[PDB]
Amino acid sequence: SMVKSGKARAHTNIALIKYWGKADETYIIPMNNSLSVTLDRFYTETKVTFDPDFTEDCLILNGNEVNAKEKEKIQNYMNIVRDLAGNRLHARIESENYVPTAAGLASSASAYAALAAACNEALSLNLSDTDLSRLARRGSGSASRSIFGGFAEWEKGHDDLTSYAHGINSNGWEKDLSMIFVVINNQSKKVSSRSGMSLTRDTSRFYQYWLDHVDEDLNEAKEAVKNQDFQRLGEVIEANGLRMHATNLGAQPPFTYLVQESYDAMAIVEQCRKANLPCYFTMDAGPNVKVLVEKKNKQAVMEQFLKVFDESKIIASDIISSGVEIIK
Amino acid sequence: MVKSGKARAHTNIALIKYWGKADETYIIPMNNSLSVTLDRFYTETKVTFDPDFTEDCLILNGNEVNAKEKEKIQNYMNIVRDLAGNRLHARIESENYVPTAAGLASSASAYAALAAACNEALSLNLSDTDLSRLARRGSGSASRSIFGGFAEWEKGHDDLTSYAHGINSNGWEKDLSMIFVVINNSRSGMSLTRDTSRFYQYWLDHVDEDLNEAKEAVKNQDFQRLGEVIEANGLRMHATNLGAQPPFTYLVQESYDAMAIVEQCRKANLPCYFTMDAGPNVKVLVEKKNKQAVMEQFLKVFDESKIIASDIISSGVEIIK
Ligand SMILES: O=C(O)[C@@H]1CCCN1C(=O)COP(=O)(O)OP(=O)(O)O
Ligand SMILES: O=C(O)[C@@H]1CCCN1C(=O)COP(=O)(O)OP(=O)(O)O
């Protein structure tokens, strides 16, 4: 009778125009806008239960305790929630990732968007989509975008109030598109995108080059979406993604997320283009290659990869039209 | 009635990179380049023109050359026949003094030595300029190996104007060394990149400024200043390949491991700077006074057999005998 709960499902998203580097490390304010598509196949379901008897926040992930470290980090995030709601209630958070994390797919975007929405629901905060995006953003930058379906854009702003995402209307175009995930063999050594982007943003000799072109890329991609022009969107996003990886090469000292196998998959995309199967690739904080393709060519493109790659390593998802949702 | 000559040329490493051709037929580059010539790695080549020879023969390290190289040699020798004004075919006996199967060895020392050997054999008395032009026709990088120490290849605009020259640094080269880090996993890569790379314009926009900064650092013997610009330039070159259609890279994780050690050395008062060519090997420029200290840092991580140092040689291509 004194316990408040809410549960939400939020889907992962992949940046076509990259978020890479922060203006503000504390509040997670980015150096540039980003543009993403939200994936139907992969998502996180998160329940939060607030109870006055709880003395601290507890996080249960895929049925298992998290270590004292994750627990510490989740408690700090929930302080933001408590401050926002004006209460001192602690919560038990029970989360399930339905994201291929072992295969290298990121879950922080769906995780924080799900948590943000679940809290809004549990506490009856009535946050707008803008304020939900802002709350999610404090947990993970890319989470700001997972509040939304289809195409979404993160507006960088200049502070906590002005940095947030919104959904882009594409006249239903997202329903015609898909993404193929090529799972690429990589080392299982620890990697962090927050840490990588910070080293690059602070020291990279090629970071200015990234900054000088990103707005142009973004405008070009947005214009391509307004026109449902697949080739035009693809060319700029593929180039934007490669420029992002270029910046890491200029870091002090340099680094890369790509491995030879990543390059083999890229070669396959170009082969597909020359054989009249339009598609374009992007890569994130890892070697996995993501292939944007029109839904009607999804299978034809997949068969080309399935010549080279194990069946288990080629995973396609549609792009979902709806945004974060409240569930049982 | 037999004409023979022998020459030794040393490999050189581009500090400001040659990457991309304006003209594929005459090997004219999109930009100037700046290299240092190495003491340790070289090619000795003997050429013999026998009227009784009907076809060009290349024996390399006691063995015969593959089909692609053989064809390349016969095409190149035609240029030499044309220049000389004879029709003599030649037996070429060439020896590479480099560590075996380590990704070293260079078209640069090979064609520079071949050019000088022919020059000697046929008594052409070519000026250094025209000798660099002849070497250029075999391999662009060979234009620079005619010289020792620092050398610059001036791109010019045709066969006559595109050649290298040696740079006088008042003996500065005697104070410098280069450490090779051998790591396991160009005309074709640079071709794809020059023709298709989405980032090639970025390369062209900055190369001339890098070159000037590099040449000015050399006049002042300013190691840190030279090092910083050449490291950035090297990395921009590999960036261009990332934007190629489709993208490719010469670097592997261990290449990045070596670069990280260079960075730690700098932070430990041991100035040194890296560069990479058309492969994963990392080359580290360092002053002689710090060579051993920097090598010790590498030997903490890499095997001794993989860490190979060379001085920068002051003299240029050289006739043997
Ligand atoms: O997907 C993204 O938006 C960008 C573009 C390329 C990959 N990437 C990332 O890895 C972003 O990783 P995040 O977990 O959102 O970083 P934080 O804000 O520090 O929490
Ligand atoms: O060393 C060089 O000067 C450049 C800079 C980076 C690497 N590199 C090369 O691989 C040049 O290789 P080359 O055999 O001279 O090229 P070609 O004129 O087509 O024969």
XYZ file of C-alpha atoms and ligand atoms in Angstrom:
689
model
C 0.000 0.000 0.000
C 3.045 2.245 0.483
C 5.075 0.900 -2.426
C 5.335 2.523 -5.858
C 6.376 0.561 -8.935
C 6.741 1.068 -12.657
C 8.105 -0.976 -15.513
C 9.266 0.069 -18.941
C 10.684 -1.354 -22.143
C 13.157 0.729 -24.160
C 14.870 -0.226 -27.418
C 18.517 0.226 -28.360
C 19.506 2.666 -31.060
C 22.437 3.039 -33.424
C 23.895 6.448 -34.265
C 24.064 7.128 -38.010
C 25.555 10.530 -37.287
C 27.922 9.902 -34.351
C 27.971 11.174 -30.802
C 31.690 11.235 -30.012
C 33.151 13.542 -27.383
C 31.558 15.584 -24.577
C 31.535 19.309 -23.890
C 30.587 18.525 -20.264
C 31.674 15.314 -18.587
C 29.526 15.817 -15.499
C 26.056 16.371 -17.049
C 26.846 14.524 -20.291
C 26.600 17.397 -22.770
C 27.949 16.365 -26.234
C 30.265 18.311 -28.583
C 27.848 17.842 -31.510
C 24.322 16.707 -32.386
C 23.754 13.073 -33.279
C 21.142 11.187 -35.309
C 20.018 7.603 -34.711
C 17.542 4.889 -35.592
C 15.833 2.804 -32.930
C 15.988 -0.977 -33.325
C 12.970 -3.260 -33.016
C 14.834 -6.466 -32.093
C 16.940 -5.321 -29.123
C 15.718 -3.711 -25.899
C 15.860 -3.607 -22.120
C 12.963 -4.184 -19.723
C 13.333 -2.478 -16.354
C 11.141 -2.515 -13.252
C 11.712 -0.188 -10.312
C 10.005 -0.584 -6.979
C 10.142 2.241 -4.432
C 9.596 1.262 -0.773
C 10.130 3.522 2.307
C 11.585 0.534 4.197
C 14.376 0.221 1.632
C 17.589 1.708 3.039
C 19.529 1.820 -0.218
C 19.027 1.125 -3.902
C 19.442 -2.435 -5.079
C 20.045 -3.470 -8.688
C 19.216 -6.950 -9.990
C 20.381 -7.585 -13.537
C 19.232 -10.581 -15.573
C 18.445 -12.161 -12.212
C 21.873 -11.572 -10.657
C 23.311 -9.163 -8.070
C 25.554 -6.487 -9.464
C 28.865 -5.909 -7.689
C 29.353 -3.155 -5.079
C 30.752 -0.997 -7.888
C 27.730 -1.032 -10.199
C 25.602 -0.715 -7.090
C 27.520 2.420 -6.145
C 27.044 3.891 -9.637
C 23.326 3.078 -9.715
C 22.817 4.683 -6.327
C 24.323 7.958 -7.584
C 22.016 7.942 -10.579
C 18.975 7.330 -8.373
C 19.928 10.396 -6.332
C 19.191 12.389 -9.461
C 15.792 10.718 -9.616
C 15.130 11.341 -5.907
C 16.191 14.983 -6.266
C 13.917 15.320 -9.294
C 10.901 13.741 -7.541
C 11.580 15.474 -4.226
C 11.669 12.309 -2.135
C 14.229 10.182 -0.310
C 12.775 6.849 -1.388
C 15.167 4.074 -2.376
C 14.370 1.484 -4.994
C 14.839 -2.096 -6.023
C 15.619 -2.150 -9.734
C 15.066 -5.375 -11.616
C 16.355 -5.227 -15.174
C 16.542 -7.697 -18.074
C 18.686 -6.913 -21.153
C 17.310 -8.435 -24.348
C 20.396 -7.092 -26.168
C 23.186 -9.338 -27.548
C 25.755 -7.872 -25.129
C 28.117 -10.873 -25.241
C 28.231 -10.266 -29.007
C 29.361 -6.703 -28.351
C 26.116 -4.773 -28.766
C 25.770 -1.859 -26.321
C 22.943 -1.801 -23.787
C 23.494 1.502 -22.004
C 21.105 3.355 -24.359
C 18.154 1.015 -23.749
C 19.069 0.544 -20.085
C 18.974 4.178 -19.061
C 15.950 5.064 -21.179
C 14.080 2.136 -19.614
C 15.155 3.151 -16.115
C 14.161 6.780 -16.704
C 10.710 5.846 -17.995
C 10.126 3.245 -15.268
C 10.895 5.853 -12.607
C 8.577 8.397 -14.273
C 5.831 5.783 -14.167
C 6.507 4.563 -10.619
C 6.605 8.061 -9.154
C 3.932 9.607 -11.366
C 6.264 12.428 -12.346
C 4.445 13.241 -15.591
C 7.674 14.138 -17.383
C 7.413 15.232 -20.994
C 9.360 13.256 -23.573
C 11.904 16.074 -23.466
C 12.367 15.754 -19.742
C 12.534 11.931 -19.979
C 15.243 12.291 -22.631
C 17.093 14.690 -20.318
C 16.846 12.245 -17.382
C 18.066 9.306 -19.484
C 20.912 11.460 -20.830
C 22.373 11.900 -17.324
C 22.874 8.153 -17.267
C 24.231 7.682 -20.760
C 24.334 10.097 -23.714
C 22.942 7.662 -26.270
C 20.063 6.867 -23.878
C 18.646 10.333 -24.569
C 17.655 9.053 -28.033
C 16.119 5.731 -27.006
C 13.106 7.539 -25.565
C 12.058 7.697 -29.211
C 11.266 5.370 -32.107
C 12.329 5.631 -35.750
C 14.778 8.442 -36.479
C 15.775 10.558 -33.476
C 18.134 13.494 -33.023
C 20.035 14.544 -29.923
C 20.254 18.339 -29.749
C 23.497 19.169 -27.966
C 22.395 22.381 -26.246
C 24.748 24.060 -23.779
C 23.491 22.821 -20.393
C 21.361 20.294 -18.463
C 18.144 22.016 -19.537
C 18.901 22.304 -23.241
C 20.672 19.037 -24.108
C 18.109 16.434 -25.179
C 16.672 14.373 -28.036
C 13.446 14.428 -30.059
C 11.845 12.031 -32.533
C 11.973 12.894 -36.224
C 8.936 12.281 -38.403
C 10.049 10.567 -41.586
C 6.574 9.976 -43.031
C 6.761 6.292 -42.100
C 10.066 5.794 -43.894
C 11.557 3.948 -40.926
C 9.116 1.091 -41.712
C 10.984 0.504 -45.003
C 14.450 0.213 -43.428
C 16.496 -2.413 -41.583
C 19.880 -3.017 -40.046
C 22.064 -6.068 -40.272
C 24.512 -6.642 -37.464
C 27.718 -8.402 -38.360
C 29.148 -9.843 -35.168
C 32.877 -9.587 -35.490
C 35.492 -11.546 -33.614
C 37.150 -9.229 -31.099
C 39.327 -9.555 -27.999
C 37.382 -9.799 -24.729
C 39.656 -7.244 -22.941
C 37.797 -4.398 -21.225
C 36.726 -1.451 -23.411
C 34.984 1.851 -22.541
C 33.456 4.281 -25.033
C 33.262 7.065 -22.426
C 36.998 6.708 -21.860
C 37.851 6.372 -25.569
C 35.798 9.375 -26.661
C 37.308 11.428 -23.827
C 40.917 10.685 -24.837
C 40.092 11.461 -28.467
C 38.090 14.580 -27.647
C 40.843 15.942 -25.378
C 43.964 15.044 -27.397
C 43.195 13.977 -30.945
C 45.046 15.747 -33.711
C 42.087 15.117 -36.022
C 39.308 16.170 -33.694
C 38.915 19.644 -35.227
C 38.436 17.953 -38.625
C 35.563 15.997 -37.110
C 34.022 19.146 -35.670
C 34.313 21.072 -38.967
C 32.235 18.526 -40.854
C 29.687 17.090 -38.486
C 26.989 19.804 -38.851
C 27.207 19.591 -42.632
C 26.860 15.784 -42.425
C 23.920 16.082 -40.058
C 22.054 18.596 -42.246
C 22.708 16.399 -45.275
C 21.436 13.290 -43.525
C 18.310 15.129 -42.272
C 17.611 16.470 -45.753
C 17.985 12.924 -47.099
C 15.440 11.655 -44.586
C 12.905 14.348 -45.510
C 13.194 13.030 -49.080
C 13.333 9.327 -48.248
C 16.513 9.277 -50.353
C 18.305 6.098 -49.270
C 21.513 6.514 -51.296
C 21.967 10.079 -50.060
C 21.452 9.137 -46.402
C 23.766 6.138 -46.710
C 26.667 7.919 -48.336
C 26.890 10.646 -45.711
C 26.354 8.369 -42.705
C 28.997 5.937 -43.928
C 31.435 8.814 -44.392
C 30.519 10.337 -41.048
C 31.089 7.032 -39.272
C 34.487 6.593 -40.874
C 35.502 10.130 -39.922
C 34.671 9.315 -36.309
C 37.006 6.360 -36.393
C 39.568 8.598 -38.044
C 39.606 10.847 -34.964
C 40.764 7.961 -32.776
C 43.722 7.462 -35.092
C 44.790 11.008 -34.151
C 44.506 10.466 -30.378
C 47.534 10.793 -28.099
C 48.403 7.986 -28.404
C 46.343 6.518 -31.285
C 43.857 3.686 -31.113
C 41.260 1.888 -33.191
C 38.080 -0.129 -32.613
C 38.284 -1.816 -36.029
C 39.936 -5.138 -36.824
C 40.765 -6.704 -40.177
C 37.503 -8.660 -40.050
C 35.639 -5.326 -39.777
C 37.299 -4.274 -43.032
C 36.319 -7.581 -44.663
C 32.662 -6.876 -43.823
C 32.988 -3.339 -45.216
C 34.368 -4.769 -48.449
C 31.243 -6.935 -48.660
C 28.959 -3.907 -48.363
C 30.780 -2.222 -51.252
C 30.463 -5.437 -53.288
C 26.740 -5.409 -52.592
C 26.454 -1.815 -53.794
C 28.193 -2.630 -57.095
C 25.751 -5.528 -57.567
C 22.748 -3.220 -57.210
C 21.976 -4.042 -53.585
C 22.210 -0.610 -51.926
C 23.518 -0.639 -48.340
C 25.887 1.289 -46.073
C 27.880 0.486 -42.960
C 28.691 2.078 -39.621
C 30.708 0.959 -36.598
C 30.624 2.020 -32.947
C 32.985 1.512 -29.967
C 33.911 -1.945 -31.258
C 34.688 -4.079 -34.345
C 31.071 -5.034 -35.119
C 29.806 -3.831 -38.496
C 26.237 -2.560 -38.778
C 24.673 -2.496 -42.232
C 21.851 -0.094 -43.076
C 19.701 -1.629 -45.823
C 16.180 -1.259 -47.214
C 13.886 -3.941 -45.796
C 13.213 -5.352 -49.269
C 16.951 -6.025 -49.758
C 17.619 -7.270 -46.245
C 17.669 -10.935 -47.244
C 19.682 -10.547 -50.457
C 22.326 -8.618 -48.551
C 22.328 -11.119 -45.681
C 22.949 -14.003 -48.104
C 26.092 -12.237 -49.310
C 27.436 -12.064 -45.763
C 26.329 -15.635 -45.062
C 28.785 -16.742 -47.746
C 31.633 -15.531 -45.528
C 30.337 -15.381 -41.956
C 28.843 -17.928 -39.569
C 25.061 -17.954 -39.545
C 25.047 -17.077 -35.853
C 26.975 -13.860 -36.538
C 24.530 -12.244 -38.938
C 21.596 -10.691 -37.095
C 19.031 -8.349 -38.624
C 16.593 -6.043 -36.891
C 13.843 -3.818 -38.238
C 13.494 -0.205 -37.162
C 10.667 0.367 -34.712
C 8.238 3.274 -35.119
C 7.126 3.677 -31.484
C 9.137 4.965 -28.517
C 9.668 3.888 -24.925
C 6.745 2.034 -23.417
C 5.270 1.204 -20.061
C 4.632 -2.489 -19.538
C 3.479 -4.909 -16.850
C 82.355 -5.734 -75.339
C 80.494 -6.299 -72.081
C 79.380 -3.284 -70.024
C 79.173 -3.703 -66.235
C 78.732 -1.657 -63.076
C 77.941 -2.013 -59.411
C 76.317 0.263 -56.871
C 74.991 0.305 -53.308
C 71.871 2.283 -52.348
C 70.316 2.521 -48.886
C 66.615 2.425 -48.004
C 64.972 5.639 -46.887
C 61.945 6.313 -44.696
C 59.465 9.084 -45.589
C 58.876 11.432 -42.658
C 56.554 13.570 -44.788
C 54.786 10.848 -46.774
C 54.646 10.202 -50.503
C 51.108 8.924 -50.995
C 49.248 9.142 -54.310
C 50.374 9.843 -57.891
C 49.413 12.700 -60.213
C 50.799 10.602 -63.085
C 50.952 6.802 -62.903
C 53.069 6.394 -66.044
C 55.971 8.673 -65.177
C 55.533 8.385 -61.387
C 54.838 12.014 -60.585
C 53.487 12.475 -57.023
C 50.514 14.493 -55.729
C 52.803 16.095 -53.169
C 56.423 16.599 -52.096
C 57.950 14.165 -49.633
C 60.762 14.279 -47.083
C 62.802 11.251 -46.008
C 65.898 10.193 -44.107
C 68.279 7.585 -45.484
C 69.211 4.595 -43.284
C 72.709 3.249 -42.629
C 71.703 -0.327 -41.821
C 69.481 -1.441 -44.717
C 70.615 -1.446 -48.306
C 70.823 -3.091 -51.689
C 73.958 -3.868 -53.692
C 73.288 -4.377 -57.382
C 75.520 -5.454 -60.246
C 74.323 -5.031 -63.797
C 75.954 -6.541 -66.869
C 75.048 -5.581 -70.451
C 76.034 -8.408 -72.795
C 75.470 -7.963 -76.569
C 74.804 -11.691 -76.507
C 71.898 -11.125 -74.110
C 68.422 -11.304 -75.620
C 66.309 -10.674 -72.513
C 66.665 -8.931 -69.134
C 67.446 -11.203 -66.206
C 67.174 -10.373 -62.493
C 68.815 -12.612 -59.898
C 67.897 -11.410 -56.422
C 69.668 -12.922 -53.405
C 70.815 -15.837 -55.553
C 67.273 -16.585 -56.710
C 65.049 -15.412 -59.544
C 62.307 -12.827 -59.257
C 58.523 -13.393 -59.485
C 56.596 -12.703 -62.684
C 55.264 -9.278 -61.689
C 58.688 -7.976 -60.681
C 60.350 -9.494 -63.741
C 57.901 -7.718 -66.031
C 58.538 -4.535 -64.068
C 62.314 -4.872 -64.544
C 62.074 -5.395 -68.309
C 59.818 -2.359 -68.656
C 62.224 -0.308 -66.563
C 65.286 -1.463 -68.502
C 63.611 -0.262 -71.710
C 63.649 3.209 -70.213
C 67.359 2.779 -69.595
C 68.028 1.475 -73.096
C 66.089 4.458 -74.442
C 68.094 6.890 -72.306
C 71.404 5.232 -73.235
C 70.591 4.788 -76.918
C 71.412 1.100 -77.184
C 69.461 -2.157 -77.260
C 71.499 -4.188 -74.801
C 69.713 -6.446 -72.354
C 71.243 -6.909 -68.930
C 71.808 -9.521 -66.302
C 71.047 -8.006 -62.929
C 72.497 -9.559 -59.783
C 71.132 -7.892 -56.715
C 71.559 -8.513 -53.003
C 69.357 -7.085 -50.232
C 70.996 -6.398 -46.893
C 67.941 -6.282 -44.649
C 66.635 -8.539 -41.900
C 64.909 -11.508 -43.522
C 61.116 -11.779 -43.862
C 60.482 -8.806 -41.567
C 58.536 -6.629 -43.991
C 61.560 -4.429 -44.587
C 63.345 -4.254 -47.935
C 62.425 -1.515 -50.384
C 61.794 -0.767 -53.970
C 63.590 2.460 -52.938
C 67.093 1.031 -52.434
C 66.562 -1.486 -55.248
C 65.863 1.021 -58.022
C 68.271 3.636 -56.726
C 71.086 1.065 -56.846
C 69.920 -0.225 -60.247
C 69.876 3.312 -61.634
C 73.362 4.060 -60.302
C 74.718 0.713 -61.568
C 73.419 1.344 -65.092
C 74.781 4.897 -64.965
C 78.182 3.402 -64.149
C 77.964 0.482 -66.553
C 77.017 2.657 -69.533
C 79.197 5.628 -68.471
C 76.309 8.148 -68.611
C 77.814 10.503 -66.021
C 74.274 11.538 -64.976
C 74.034 14.462 -62.559
C 72.443 13.641 -59.208
C 69.222 15.257 -60.471
C 68.999 13.089 -63.567
C 70.014 10.031 -61.588
C 67.113 10.750 -59.196
C 64.821 11.175 -62.203
C 65.921 7.783 -63.545
C 65.414 6.095 -60.187
C 61.996 7.783 -59.886
C 60.810 5.990 -63.031
C 61.301 2.649 -61.281
C 59.860 3.537 -57.879
C 58.925 6.966 -56.618
C 60.678 6.407 -53.303
C 63.896 5.456 -55.144
C 64.278 9.058 -56.284
C 65.202 9.901 -52.696
C 67.713 7.083 -52.097
C 70.188 8.745 -54.477
C 70.921 10.863 -51.408
C 71.943 10.432 -47.779
C 70.637 12.149 -44.639
C 67.536 14.274 -45.203
C 66.244 14.426 -48.783
C 63.187 15.973 -50.397
C 61.397 14.736 -53.513
C 60.040 17.786 -55.388
C 56.880 16.706 -57.154
C 57.389 18.996 -60.148
C 54.876 18.549 -62.967
C 56.552 16.302 -65.552
C 59.435 13.876 -66.156
C 61.978 16.691 -66.194
C 60.975 18.594 -63.049
C 60.050 15.783 -60.653
C 63.082 14.667 -58.675
C 64.816 14.637 -55.295
C 67.681 16.548 -53.731
C 69.746 16.052 -50.598
C 69.239 18.509 -47.777
C 72.225 19.900 -45.898
C 71.403 19.926 -42.164
C 74.926 20.786 -41.016
C 75.546 17.193 -39.965
C 72.370 16.918 -37.911
C 71.702 13.443 -39.351
C 74.780 12.225 -37.414
C 72.836 12.894 -34.190
C 69.722 10.905 -35.153
C 68.735 7.218 -35.264
C 65.700 5.109 -36.041
C 64.388 2.113 -34.112
C 62.402 -0.457 -36.059
C 59.713 -2.439 -34.354
C 59.074 -5.547 -36.409
C 55.411 -6.441 -36.332
C 53.609 -9.176 -38.287
C 50.115 -9.072 -39.738
C 51.840 0.244 -51.727
C 51.385 1.254 -55.397
C 47.992 -0.531 -55.184
C 46.874 0.796 -51.802
C 47.978 4.366 -52.577
C 46.191 4.054 -55.933
C 42.840 3.093 -54.410
C 43.200 5.835 -51.788
C 44.347 8.556 -54.195
C 41.457 7.680 -56.536
C 38.623 7.014 -54.100
C 39.303 8.145 -50.547
C 36.741 10.420 -48.954
C 39.547 11.903 -46.816
C 42.189 12.466 -49.492
C 41.370 16.162 -49.894
C 42.076 16.499 -46.162
C 45.536 15.029 -46.803
C 46.254 17.455 -49.667
C 45.046 20.461 -47.684
C 47.650 19.872 -44.955
C 50.653 18.210 -46.609
C 52.387 21.408 -47.835
C 52.150 23.010 -44.379
C 53.562 19.849 -42.767
C 56.410 19.856 -45.259
C 57.310 23.490 -44.532
C 57.182 22.928 -40.791
C 59.355 19.857 -41.212
C 61.904 21.641 -43.399
C 62.091 24.551 -40.970
C 62.648 22.225 -37.995
C 65.562 20.720 -39.939
C 67.169 24.144 -40.537
C 67.023 24.759 -36.786
C 67.861 21.167 -35.783
C 64.762 21.230 -33.616
C 63.965 17.630 -32.782
C 60.658 18.037 -30.963
C 59.324 20.333 -33.652
C 60.350 17.993 -36.478
C 58.980 14.991 -34.584
C 55.547 16.427 -33.834
C 54.774 17.403 -37.421
C 56.037 14.136 -38.948
C 54.039 11.990 -36.494
C 50.843 13.898 -37.312
C 51.573 13.648 -41.055
C 52.189 9.906 -40.874
C 48.908 9.350 -39.072
C 46.991 11.515 -41.575
C 48.318 9.251 -44.329
C 46.818 6.161 -42.695
C 43.605 8.125 -42.074
C 43.272 8.522 -45.854
C 43.105 4.744 -46.256
C 40.268 4.615 -43.730
C 38.188 6.705 -46.154
C 39.054 4.633 -49.251
C 36.321 2.795 -51.149
C 36.270 0.321 -49.489
C 38.330 1.238 -46.404
C 41.570 -0.514 -45.475
C 44.409 -0.299 -42.955
C 48.093 -1.235 -42.744
C 48.069 -1.200 -38.938
C 47.370 -3.987 -36.433
C 46.902 -3.814 -32.650
C 50.604 -4.383 -31.920
C 51.373 -1.319 -34.068
C 49.247 0.695 -31.615
C 51.031 -0.980 -28.702
C 54.351 0.293 -30.039
C 53.012 3.850 -30.565
C 51.819 3.899 -26.954
C 55.360 3.122 -25.792
C 56.649 6.071 -27.812
C 54.131 8.283 -26.026
C 55.246 7.021 -22.602
C 58.868 7.664 -23.508
C 58.078 11.310 -24.265
C 56.395 11.659 -20.870
C 59.566 10.186 -19.356
C 61.899 12.816 -20.844
C 62.845 10.588 -23.787
C 61.775 12.425 -26.944
C 60.958 10.109 -29.848
C 58.316 9.991 -32.603
C 56.817 7.222 -34.701
C 55.900 6.657 -38.320
C 54.486 3.747 -40.321
C 54.653 2.860 -44.017
C 52.720 0.333 -46.113
C 52.678 -2.258 -43.319
C 52.344 -2.684 -39.524
C 56.030 -2.087 -38.624
C 56.513 0.948 -36.391
C 59.530 3.143 -37.000
C 60.761 5.334 -34.173
C 62.928 8.396 -34.799
C 65.100 9.214 -31.758
C 68.258 11.205 -31.030
C 71.372 9.005 -30.621
C 71.798 10.177 -27.036
C 68.449 8.542 -26.118
C 68.537 5.533 -28.439
C 69.549 2.938 -25.827
C 67.115 4.262 -23.196
C 64.206 4.174 -25.652
C 65.179 0.683 -26.810
C 65.129 -0.530 -23.171
C 61.542 0.675 -22.902
C 60.543 -1.309 -25.978
C 62.418 -4.391 -24.726
C 60.191 -4.429 -21.669
C 57.321 -5.385 -23.994
C 58.705 -6.607 -27.343
C 61.230 -9.368 -28.079
C 64.869 -8.373 -28.691
C 64.744 -10.047 -32.109
C 61.996 -7.576 -33.049
C 63.748 -4.342 -32.063
C 66.239 -3.204 -34.700
C 68.106 0.133 -34.660
C 69.832 1.984 -37.480
C 71.732 5.227 -37.813
C 70.891 7.743 -40.514
C 73.660 7.659 -43.114
C 75.217 10.933 -44.376
C 76.472 9.764 -47.777
C 74.310 8.939 -50.800
C 74.249 6.236 -53.453
C 77.691 4.768 -54.048
C 79.601 3.023 -56.828
C 81.270 -0.215 -55.813
C 84.650 -1.115 -57.340
O 26.234 5.277 -29.789
C 26.663 6.465 -29.851
O 25.833 7.411 -29.835
C 28.108 6.761 -29.924
C 28.508 6.913 -31.351
C 29.577 5.883 -31.607
C 29.494 4.942 -30.449
N 28.883 5.685 -29.399
C 29.046 5.351 -28.026
O 29.746 4.392 -27.744
C 28.401 6.126 -26.926
O 28.417 5.465 -25.709
P 27.686 5.973 -24.425
O 27.421 4.778 -23.546
O 26.396 6.653 -24.854
O 28.650 7.029 -23.751
P 28.387 7.901 -22.463
O 27.540 9.106 -22.787
O 29.703 8.333 -21.879
O 27.579 7.093 -21.481
O 58.096 5.244 -48.928
C 57.365 6.196 -49.321
O 57.920 7.244 -49.740
C 55.891 6.106 -49.297
C 55.377 6.856 -48.111
C 54.612 5.872 -47.280
C 54.937 4.525 -47.825
N 55.433 4.763 -49.141
C 55.434 3.752 -50.140
O 55.001 2.658 -49.813
C 55.953 4.010 -51.520
O 56.200 2.882 -52.281
P 56.798 2.942 -53.730
O 57.331 1.580 -54.074
O 57.860 4.020 -53.778
O 55.621 3.366 -54.684
P 55.673 3.342 -56.257
O 56.208 4.679 -56.718
O 54.312 3.057 -56.823
O 56.640 2.261 -56.673
